[PDB]
């Protein structure tokens, strides 16, 4: 279910989504709020996560750059070509 992802300040992480089919519609969330989404093919990062991330247009995997400790939260992603949600938990490591 939920995977614990450990990171490090100023560093960057990558949420690996075990996929196969190129889900061309996905939405990443940092709890109640959105992070990045894919609509009919029109990428869109929100707020702080602007320029700060990269979304794999095939395995719907997400990659955040430059961790800020304020990112240590609960992440979850959704998609129609689904099979019940994926919830990652980021732990912004120390250094």
């Amino acid at each position: 279910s939920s995977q614990q992802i450990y990171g490090v300040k100023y560093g960057n992480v990558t949420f690996h989504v075990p996929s196969n089919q190129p889900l061309k519609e996905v939405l990443w969330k940092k709890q109640k709020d959105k992070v990045a989404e894919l609509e009919n093919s029109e990428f869109r990062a929100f707020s702080s996560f602007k320029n700060r991330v990269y979304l794999d247009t095939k395995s719907g995997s997400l990659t955040i750059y430059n961790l800020t400790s304020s990112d240590e939260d609960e992440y979850e992603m959704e998609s129609p070509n689904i099979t019940d949600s994926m919830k990652f938990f980021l732990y912004v490591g120390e250094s």
Partner: protein
Amino acid sequence: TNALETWGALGQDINLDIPSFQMSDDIDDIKWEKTSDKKKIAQFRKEKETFKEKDTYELLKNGALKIKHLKTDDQDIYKVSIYDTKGKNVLEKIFDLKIQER
């Protein structure tokens, strides 16, 4: 758990209204999801054309979802997710559509 239990009558239409909601400009993604099956039926994105799975549904100003000629399947747990122009959650509410076979 705050499932605002709603009562509908078989064959007739129904309106799922969002309480103290007010349509602004900060609004962007109004989403209406049908729990069980888990896939949006309606969605209002800023200015990108209102999406609707079946004409059975209709979006009404102020994110109101309309379910025409209720059916036996139309009985589910409906959720609404409204996001602003910043990817923030403006509000979240759940509806318990219980249709009575009067």
